[PDB]
Design a protein around this ligand. Structure first.
Ligand SMILES: O=c1cc(O)n([C@@H]2O[C@H](COP(=O)(O)O)[C@@H](O)[C@H]2O)c(=O)[nH]1
Ligand SMILES: O=c1cc(O)n([C@@H]2O[C@H](COP(=O)(O)O)[C@@H](O)[C@H]2O)c(=O)[nH]1
Lengths: 215, 213
């Protein structure tokens, strides 16, 4: 995927009018938008096609798919039919669950991103300990796209080592309570930024500032 | 939670007309319906209030919530605002992620179910090893409702030991797990396709209910 400015917008506003306005304002800097359940459950799956048409952006559906294989397939298919370019899926439910999502993505000409490790404090309890193994499972399954935490660069470096240089890696948890934009981009292909942009008084300026900091 | 006949319908059909037809056909047996992303993503979140209105049933939103705290908070608010009586949340992402859902539920007067172990084969890779710790985490958080797999009776028994007798436990994967034995440990069983794909859902439900007593 070709992510403009290596910066992905996490559009987690839950009001259509506000989500549209903010996303529109930063289209000059960002052409790849991560849409998750807060927006989708508030405004409907139609919002994905609307965003694509209105802003001419790529959409990553951040649905953290985490069910049994048959249910996973149903979610993935519905999500791709709704126009998503890619979908983010959890690895902790096991290889069969992940394989199911890969089935559907292959069948429909779309992409799966595998979430191997998370950025919040609770990730220390069970996810961190499984992270290397989940990433290796991804490699064994032929996964090419990954999501991993910027909150700790040493962990992010280890992930990149597991998945190789050819794999695509995107990373959330950027900022004060997270990692540094520049440092993260030593290992990740793109960073994901949400509230710092969408709650900013001037979202366009917030985005420009982040891109400046990583010139 | 009072589940009629200890039997929860997993309404995973993706067509509103068919979902409504089948649910109507078994309402005389089942008053508690699990609605997941397949139906909600196809037909929209409004389907939850429509089910509760049309059937006078309780709805468990099976969204397997598995994000960071701030995102889980948003998902739970939207879900409860849509009328869900309960939401199912993953424990694997850790305590703060679960706490977020619990706090929202408690603020809104709704319920959280903690999913501790899953029923499918891949569950053995990562989740099974963490399942008892996840249940113990839930217990300390004050979780009172749990989900665990009918396909592994020994695991289900241990989960019941951990959560204690006062906690509420529901269990899918029946087919597969046996209804009667599962109910030695679970308060209710969850059943999907063997009811909703049947020639006669009512009889299918009636049969299951019969095999229990
Ligand atoms: O480990 C992870 C995985 C995520 O998807 N995310 C997601 O990335 C986004 C981050 O947004 P924010 O920059 O406002 O923290 C949110 O949509 C969140 O759900 C995350 O923060 N950490
Ligand atoms: O471990 C689990 C957790 C679940 O929620 N489920 C859910 O329970 C339901 C089971 O449906 P079925 O009886 O047709 O197998 C599905 O909605 C599925 O997503 C499961 O099967 N195993």
């Amino acid at each position: 995927m070709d992510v403009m400015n290596r910066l992905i917008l996490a559009m987690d506003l839950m009001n259509r009018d506000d989500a549209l306005r903010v996303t529109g304002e930063v289209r000059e800097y960002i052409d790849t938008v991560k849409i998750g359940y807060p927006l989708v459950l508030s405004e409907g799956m139609d919002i994905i096609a609307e965003f694509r048409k209105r802003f001419g952006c790529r959409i990553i559906a951040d649905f953290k798919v985490a069910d049994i294989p048959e249910t996973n397939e149903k979610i993935c298919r519905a999500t791709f039919k709704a126009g998503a370019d890619a979908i983010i899926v959890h690895g902790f439910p096991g290889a069969d669950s992940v394989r199911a999502c890969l089935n559907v993505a292959e069948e429909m000409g779309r992409e799966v991103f595998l979430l191997t490790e998370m950025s919040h404090p609770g990730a220390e309890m069970f996810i961190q300990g499984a992270a290397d193994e989940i990433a290796r499972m991804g490699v064994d399954l032929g996964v090419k796209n990954y999501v991993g935490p910027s909150t700790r660069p040493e962990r992010l470096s280890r992930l990149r080592e597991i998945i190789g240089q050819d794999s695509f890696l995107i990373s959330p948890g950027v900022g004060a309570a997270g990692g540094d934009p520049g440092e993260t981009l030593r290992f990740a292909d793109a960073i994901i930024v949400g509230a710092s942009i969408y709650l900013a008084d001037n979202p366009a300026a917030a985005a420009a500032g982040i891109i400046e900091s990583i010139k």
